[PDB]
């Protein structure tokens, strides 16, 4: 039915029944109301680029919608997309005036590349929102850092480090998408779902220090050998 | 009803960011020309799962989504800022949108002290 | 006053379209990615002229136009979404925007059951 | 004075007096309030293109204004305008973001052509609104289907087929405007006010089936011979 | 508190401009197509410093700026039109946002005439 | 703390304490609330172009913000800026849709010229607003007449002549800015702070009537010889 409103009662969070009036409920001003955003991360969804991009898809005929929210959660994983069609045209719209990136991201996964982009806008296939700076959108904007999340509404009771991880993509938004983790402009690693951000950063440092970067004009691509816990509770070639 | 977290996992700690519009600025920091850039307007906090509120919040936001999406589909407004104000209005209309019948279940008026104030006067009149 | 249709003609039947924001979606239809396009978000209905409401509505909208246009002239807002919310606020301020004097013509408080509740107690006190 | 608000009382619709307070009036939530749009059609105005375009005019110095409305009436007649000056510049502004055509139209009268367009925006000379998709505007947008209508506000008590009819116009927006009903790109019929949409569609089908379309590279224009009820209660040449 | 003008100077007269949304238009002037251009929608007035209101107003607007700027910093809305409506809501919530205890300092209900209405009946009952 | 609200009490204007509830206070409708704009002029600030432009400065990283206001004060002095960098790029953004110039100005000081403009937007260094037509902004828009002012909020109790003065500027927005009052396109006067608008207009008329305008293709610049009250209470060369 209507949009639920959370309220603290009996030492527990509840949704207030509109069909039942509680006079003991006290709302003393609009400052007692809050909209808040929570990250899908916090529910345990896979956050690696291959798993996360499978949750987004292109669709035409549905106008985008934005809703504001006033407080949010620091993110471990955010994303920033520069996707083009094979012919060079942009797949994503420029960010509307006043929409900036999500404000707290430990790792920004920046994906550049190409896909067929068969639809006017990119939506969340599970109905979640793309969280920007205190604005939640149903669609992805070009080159703008976002976290996946959902919004709640409440009656209240009466340093920062960011690291960008860059990737190339072909067939973005399809069944068989290909991802490459970028070490420099000529040195790439075949991306797997199981690669955590910390692992990619260590893999990058050991490639620089071991001198496994390309030393030709050509593109060098590494495949990494074989070598259930959430983030808060913890020329081709081969490398083993 | 009480909120029943049915997610595969729950991060029990909430490291959050927000703003404060009544922020006591020191000196000239409130002047836009002199104040912080867009990236520095945020306060931070950390909230633990006392009374299970964090896990409740994650489930609440999850369950809000269907109704919130259906609302966004039906509005022609490009950016919606009015949901909380409308809820405060509905809070008021639910209680005061009609005649308030004292002692009736839909009238939030307490005549207790007034009934007792009258009761002390009748006991005085009986003494007369 | 009652609305007096003074139009050259009146279509007495109202074949209408609108939306519903609390629309019980089946399965995934509420997810924007999976749901209807802009053209398919509408419900339809047909209302006849019982109590002359259709012809009254046409005249009301006609007569609203001057005041609505003068309002739009004076606002600098490009798109106005706030008229109904403001009317609900004014509805509340008209009744509760000041001290409510019980039994006075501008105070929507019914003390009937409370007066009778007191009356049953005095008859009990007289029996004592 | 103030914007009127309709309310049902004594089995009749009334406008509520603001100077008089009625405590029996019950407003239990904002969901009890509605804005609605009604079509000028329903009051019996002539709906043919020549008669309807005479109600619109160009004006400078007046900023456009939009107001939303939540429910509307299925239209028999809507209009869609592609008007240019003789020099090729557009007379009408592109539709603002989020403004789509009126959602229910039996016949869309699409008028293309030229006029002097002596003003920055096209307004309704009687003060009515142009009704789009749940937005009412004081001005006409280019290429965007609208119905003529007016808006009311209420306290509530406690398939689809569309056919486009195309026209050419010269001297649009003036005393002596000329209209042509388009059969194909080379076959036109001199438009009269008395021609109903159903008549134009039958005239079009009998021209195709009789082979009265142009069979040269040139433009063929037909004039139709001589041959009070509202819609809900029911090379040049000659043809008789 | 009372407003204390502490400006270097004060213009004691206020020659002002504004609009009126309930402006009684003559004939067709309310029709946008026929009405005034953007430059002609204004009424004018002149207000003198009776009760020191003009100099008070200048100081009030001056002192409002810090809080208003801090509010604008924290909102993501590009153009804010909602401040007065929100204040009217807060006015209502301050008085009616909870149970109203008659005779208590936070309940704007006057039972005077109702207490006297009851008092006239008891004097009648005592006469019986 | 919160945004103050002015109210008339004891024959004096007061700010209402939110922590204290006054039941005698009557708010009968939203029409009893007003937002109003007052001009910095009225507090006695210097209004000459050199003094006034020193109160504005360029800054990056801070998004612009607009708030509406419903009534304002007739201005003696307004300003209108066409500032470019030395390389020809605009320093100020075009006025957003629906933002027009401040509606009552005795003198519009129109300044054209160049400066380094080291920041994305021009802000008021004292926290005041730029007042436009019933919209107050934190930033200056290109070519759009504004007055400097501040906004208040109230609970209410229960011809026009404009003259444009044109100036050229170099080093706009810096310590050492240079201003020239423009008589015609080839005749300028070195601007001083002490020059009132009425004096500049008289200086202009006596230059035309005395024939002290340039009579070559080149630019003639005059310096004026030596020859505490507020406005409401009252080739180079030389001229004495
Ligand atoms: C609120 O919280 C709930 C509970 O956490 C979330 O529920 C999730 O909802 C989504 C879809 O709405 C579910 O995803 C779907 O899963 C189906 C079956 O699950 C597969 O994967 C699981 C592992 O998670 C296996 O155990 C299982 O055997 C299945 O293999 C899929 O069949 C669906 O497939 C669809 O999408 C794919 C991807 O493109 C297509 O290829 C298919 O053709 C098909 O269209 C779909 O992926 C998810 O499982 C639910 N999670 C849980 C824990 O129940 C809500 O989403 C959340 N609300 C919001 C707004 O976030
Ligand atoms: C709410 O409902 C009322 C009632 O239905 C509507 O009233 C109409 O208002 C318009 C103008 O506001 C009227 O139109 C004007 O008519 C004048 C005289 O009418 C002529 O036509 C009628 C046939 O309808 C004849 O009987 C009569 O003898 C006249 O020949 C005209 O003189 C006016 O002319 C102006 O416009 C024309 C067209 O460009 C110019 O050439 C002229 O120079 C002049 O500027 C004008 O056309 C209309 O008659 C009214 N109808 C009725 C039934 O009274 C409201 O409009 C409606 N409100 C809204 C917002 O829709
Ligand atoms: C509400 O009302 C109050 C009172 O009227 C206004 O207060 C003014 O606030 C501004 C700054 O916020 C003050 O300006 C500052 O003045 C400092 C000292 O004043 C000099 O000038 C005065 C003459 O007015 C001399 O008497 C004095 O000796 C000083 O020489 C300056 O040091 C400051 O300098 C800063 O800016 C300059 C200019 O770019 C830079 O070069 C400096 O490096 C430095 O950054 C500044 O100019 C002003 O004096 C106050 N007036 C009064 C009367 O107190 C509020 O501004 C007003 N609020 C709003 C929103 O309008
Ligand atoms: C007991 S649940 C109320 C909370 C408690 C914390 C602070 C909150 C807040 O926004 N305070 C604000 C209130 C206004 C004040 N001027 C500044 C602080 C209110 C946000 C919060 C939350 C929730 C979900 C996601 C992110 C953040 C965390 C929920
Ligand atoms: C008795 S007069 C109330 C009406 C009755 C019908 C349905 C209405 C409506 O919008 N219902 C909505 C109410 C919210 C609900 N979640 C979905 C349905 C309310 C619109 C209507 C009308 C009026 C004029 C023009 C077009 C349409 C027709 C007027
Ligand atoms: C006693 S203080 C209330 C004032 C009195 C005058 C008229 C005011 C007004 O806006 N009246 C409006 C009220 C609505 C009506 N439909 C049309 C007139 C209300 C504006 C005013 C003011 C203040 C500061 C700056 C500029 C203007 C001057 C303050
Ligand atoms: C493409 O995607 C579909 C659906 O996810 C899958 O069944 C199919 O095997 C994939 N590959 C090809 C070649 O179709
Ligand atoms: C790598 O490529 C990007 C884009 O092609 C370019 O902007 C960047 O300068 C390059 N870096 C180096 C070190 O060449
Ligand atoms: C990879 O390692 C090099 C070597 O220090 C470093 O400069 C670069 O920033 C690293 N890349 C990332 C994404 O951290
Ligand atoms: C040159 O590249 C090869 C393969 O990337 C690498 O094994 C070798 O160490 C490099 N030489 C250096 C870094 O001197
Ligand atoms: C043009 O329009 C006016 C006003 O409608 C009309 O009087 C005139 O006869 C028309 N034709 C010409 C040639 O002016
Ligand atoms: C008719 O003309 C229009 C526009 O000139 C064009 O788009 C359309 O293709 C043409 N149709 C045919 C059948 O040539
Ligand atoms: C006119 O008739 C032809 C023949 O069937 C048809 O294809 C065309 O769509 C008709 N035009 C309209 C406007 O219905
Ligand atoms: C050719 O055109 C003429 C005039 O339009 C028409 O009378 C004739 O039947 C056409 N010929 C055909 C359709 O074969
Ligand atoms: C430039 O401005 C600064 C600060 O206002 C001032 O100290 C300095 O003297 C000015 N001139 C030069 C040449 O730096
Ligand atoms: C003066 O210069 C301006 C801009 O350079 C130009 O628009 C204007 O026409 C000129 N006036 C004369 C009289 O040449
Ligand atoms: C300067 O004087 C001339 C001569 O009358 C006049 O035309 C011009 O408008 C004046 N300039 C200003 C800014 O008033
Ligand atoms: C020519 O210019 C000079 C200097 O501006 C001036 O003194 C002289 O009067 C002018 N001659 C005229 C106006 O005939």
UniProtKB/Swiss-Prot annotation, chains A, D, F:
Q: What does the record say about PTM?
A: O-glycosylated in the mucin-like region.
Name of protein: GP1
Gene field: GP
Summarizing the annotation, the consequence of altering residue 58 to A is: About 50% loss of ability to counteract host BST2
Organism, by scientific name, is Zaire ebolavirus (strain Mayinga-76)
* Cystine connections: 78-105, 91-117
Purpose of the protein: Responsible for binding to the receptor(s) on target cells. Interacts with CD209/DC-SIGN and CLEC4M/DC-SIGNR which act as cofactors for virus entry into dendritic cells (DCs) and endothelial cells. Binding to the macrophage specific lectin CLEC10A also seems to enhance virus infectivity. Interaction with FOLR1/folate receptor alpha may be a cofactor for virus entry in some cell types, although results are contradictory. Members of the Tyro3 receptor tyrosine kinase family also seem to be cell entry factors in filovirus infection.
The consequence of residue 23 to G is: Induces GP1 secretion. Complete loss of virus capability to enter into host cell
Instruction: Name the reported effect of residue 10 to D.
Output: Induces GP1 secretion. Complete loss of virus capability to enter into host cell
Question: What are the annotated glycosylation sites?
Answer: 10, 175, 185, 204, 215, 239
Q: How does it assemble?
A: Interacts with host entry receptor NPC1.
Q: What is the effect of changing residue 33 to K?
A: Complete loss of virus capability to enter into host cell
- What result is annotated for mutating residue 27 to A? Complete loss of virus capability to enter into host cell
| Region of interest (Receptor-binding), residue spans | 24-158
**Where in the full protein does the shown chain start and end, and how long is the full protein?**
32 to 318 of 676
Effect of changing residue 27 to F/I/K: reported as: 90% loss of virus capability to enter into host cell
> Per the record, what about its domains?
The mucin-like region seems to be involved in the cytotoxic function. This region is also involved in binding to human CLEC10A.
**Superkingdom of this entry's organism?**
Viruses
| Entry's localization field | Virion membrane; Host cell membrane
Topology relative to the lipid bilayer, per the entry, is: Peripheral membrane protein
Impact reported for residue 92 to A: About 60% loss of ability to counteract host BST2
Task: Give the site residues for Involved in receptor recognition and/or post-binding events.
Answer: 27, 33-34, 58, 65, 140
């Amino acid at each position: 039915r209507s949009i639920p409103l959370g309220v603290i009662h009996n030492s527990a969070l509840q949704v207030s029944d509109v069909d039942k009036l509680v006079c003991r409920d006290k709302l003393s001003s609009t400052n007692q109301l809050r909209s808040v955003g929570l990250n899908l991360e916090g529910n345990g969804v896979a956050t690696d680029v291959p798993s996360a991009t499978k949750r987004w898809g292109f669709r035409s005929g549905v106008p985008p919608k934005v809703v504001n929210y006033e407080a949010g959660e620091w993110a471990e994983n955010c994303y920033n997309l520069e996707i083009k069609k094979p012919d060079g045209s942009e797949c994503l719209p420029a960010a509307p005036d006043g929409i900036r990136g999500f404000p707290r991201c430990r790792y920004v996964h920046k994906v550049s590349g190409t896909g067929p982009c068969a639809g006017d806008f990119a939506f969340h296939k599970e109905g979640a929102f793309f969280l920007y700076d205190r604005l939640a959108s149903t669609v992805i904007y070009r080159g703008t850092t976002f976290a996946e999340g959902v919004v709640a509404f409440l009656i209240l009771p009466q340093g920062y480090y960011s690291t960008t991880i860059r990737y190339q993509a072909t067939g973005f938004g399809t069944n068989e998408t290909e991802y490459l983790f970028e070490v420099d402009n000529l040195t790439y690693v075949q991306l797997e779902s199981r690669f955590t951000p910390q692992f990619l950063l260590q893999l990058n440092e050991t490639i620089y220090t071991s001198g496994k970067r390309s030393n030709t004009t050509g593109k060098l691509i590494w495949k990494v050998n074989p070598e259930e816990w959430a983030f808060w509770e913890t020329x081709x070639x081969x490398x083993x | 009803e009480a909120i029943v977290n049915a997610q595969p996992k729950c991060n029990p700690n909430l490291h959050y960011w927000t703003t404060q519009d009544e922020g006591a600025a020191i000196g000239l920091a409130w002047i836009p020309y002199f104040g912080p850039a867009a990236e520095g307007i945020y306060i931070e906090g950390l909230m633990h799962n006392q009374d299970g509120l964090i896990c409740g919040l994650r489930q609440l936001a999850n369950e809000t989504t269907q109704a919130l999406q259906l609302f966004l589909r039906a509005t022609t407004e490009l950016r919606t800022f009015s949901i909380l104000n409308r809820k405060a209005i509905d809070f008021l209309l639910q209680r005061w949108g009609g005649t308030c019948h004292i002692l009736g279940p839909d009238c939030c008026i307490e005549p207790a002290d007034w009934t007792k104030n009258i009761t002390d006067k009748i006991d005085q009149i009986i003494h007369d």
